[PDB]
């Protein structure tokens, strides 16, 4: 019986005591850093402070939990019990609380910036904090007194005890601890950060594709044929006089203009010059049909030609829209390639026609990647759920799936399940010297 368990009971006792050591001296000095120095109170990191104390926290009772797995008994006492069984829940829930918050609030930033100046405070993420410590003793409040010192056979076991029926309330309670601790938040991350990460490759939609092709200007200025244009592609008049295009964008406006407009003036007017393509697309009969036959890239590439150069211009090429109607695409590029539209504008045309051939927004694709923070924010999230996504299926499967307790392969498995859930809570202070320009100049 001993020279299968001594070995990984020890073995475990020195592993153990290795993620408290970093982990719990990590989290502390982290912690003390985060109150002391001033360059380090943003919301983000308040909200590492919070992730920190669960973590140490976490990392303190693990002396403990050795001795269960050595002494193959709980010799310390029950007011013990009590609290290595509340903290170890506490960490479990606070932690995935506080990474989802974490998520949210980047995604706040990031992807809402004009409107995150308002609410990213960090008085708004200590409050944060202090919430998901209250609502972590919602659960954390009964398991603290549910935990209780009971002889099973052989051994003093410190365990929960659940009013009767216990397998019950049992099943219950992991199922809602399957739920909330675990599906939930990492759905929430998902969905924050699937948006955040969606976001930043190339372009896919119109209005994206028009910006990279009328670009965008706040002052007045002259265009490509020599009219007088402001914002994005938007034409004022065909007066060579600069007086009546003024006057012109102060009756768009509605205000005293100067000849300089705002970002988001230039789009609230963006948004009518779509309108009126789109709505001229429809007017015209030449257009509507080969309009409605057509996938959305396409119609977005028939509807930069329209606000290019207007429906009485695109109406004129009767025989390139009847190729693309047949959906006979490179013979399309081939007529619409020799033009007066190529000629003028080789470029954009060059794109637009690729666009029409392939039927992907490939001819504009140019690739950025992520934020310092953000990415960061990222690896943390992965981390937990490396770590936390094996015993909290398993938890599951176990109280669900037959077989259990049969041999030491899947004893060892699970244990060691266990043990690397533990060991993300050392893991979160190695990460933050590598990801932090913030915390690598200390
Ligand atoms: O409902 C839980 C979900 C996930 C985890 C558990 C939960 O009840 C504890 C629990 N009961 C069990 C019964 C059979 C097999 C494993 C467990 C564990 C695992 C664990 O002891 C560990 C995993 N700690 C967390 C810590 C290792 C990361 C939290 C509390 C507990």
Redesign the pocket.
């Known amino acids: 019986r001993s020279a299968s368990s001594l070995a990984l009971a020890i073995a475990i006792t020195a592993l153990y005591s290795a993620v408290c050591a970093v982990g719990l001296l990590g989290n502390v000095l982290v912690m003390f850093g985060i109150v002391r120095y001033t360059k380090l109170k943003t919301a983000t990191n308040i909200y590492i402070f919070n992730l920190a104390l669960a973590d140490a926290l976490a990392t303190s009772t693990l002396p403990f939990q050795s001795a269960k797995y050595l002494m193959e008994t709980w010799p310390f006492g029950e007011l013990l019990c009590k609290a290595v069984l509340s903290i170890?829940?506490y960490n479990?829930f606070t932690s995935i609380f506080t990474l989802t918050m974490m998520s949210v609030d980047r995604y706040i930033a990031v992807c809402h910036p004009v409107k995150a100046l308002d609410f990213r405070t960090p008085a708004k993420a200590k409050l944060i904090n202090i919430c998901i410590w209250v609502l972590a003793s919602g659960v954390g409040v009964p398991i603290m007194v549910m935990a209780v010192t009971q002889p099973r056979d052989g051994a003093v076991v410190c365990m929960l005890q659940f009013p009767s029926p216990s397998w019950y309330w049992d099943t219950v309670?992991?199922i809602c601890?399957f739920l909330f601790?675990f599906v939930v938040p990492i759905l929430i991350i998902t969905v924050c950060y699937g948006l955040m990460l969606l976001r930043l490759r190339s372009v896919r939609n119109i209005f994206e594709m028009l910006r990279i092709d009328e670009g965008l200007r706040l002052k007045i200025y002259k265009n490509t044929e020599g009219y007088y244009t402001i914002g994005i592609g938007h034409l004022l008049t065909k007066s060579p006089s600069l007086n009546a295009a003024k006057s012109e964008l102060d009756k768009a406006i509605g205000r005293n203009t100067n000849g300089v407009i705002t970002k988001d003036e230039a789009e609230k007017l963006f948004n009518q010059d779509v309108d009126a393509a789109v709505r001229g697309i429809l007017r015209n009969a030449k257009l509507k049909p080969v309009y409605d036959s057509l996938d959305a890239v396409r119609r977005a590439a028939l509807i930069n030609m329209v606000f290019q150069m207007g429906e009485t211009g695109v109406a004129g090429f009767t025989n390139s829209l009847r190729m693309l109607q047949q959906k006979r695409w490179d013979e399309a590029a081939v007529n619409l390639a020799k033009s007066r539209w190529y000629n003028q504008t080789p470029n954009r045309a060059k794109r637009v026609i690729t666009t029409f051939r392939t039927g992907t927004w490939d001819a504009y694709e140019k690739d950025r990647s992520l934020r310092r923070i953000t990415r960061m924010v990222l690896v943390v999230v992965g981390a937990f759920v490396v770590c936390?996504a094996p015993?909290?299926i398993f938890?599951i499967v176990?109280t669900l799936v037959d077989i259990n307790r049969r041999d030491p392969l899947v004893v060892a498995a699970?244990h060691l399940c266990?043990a690397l859930?533990?060991a993300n809570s050392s893991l979160n202070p190695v990460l933050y010297a590598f990801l932090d320009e913030n915390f690598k100049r200390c």
């Open positions: 170890d829940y479990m309670t992991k601890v601790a936390w015993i909290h938890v176990w699970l266990i859930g533990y």
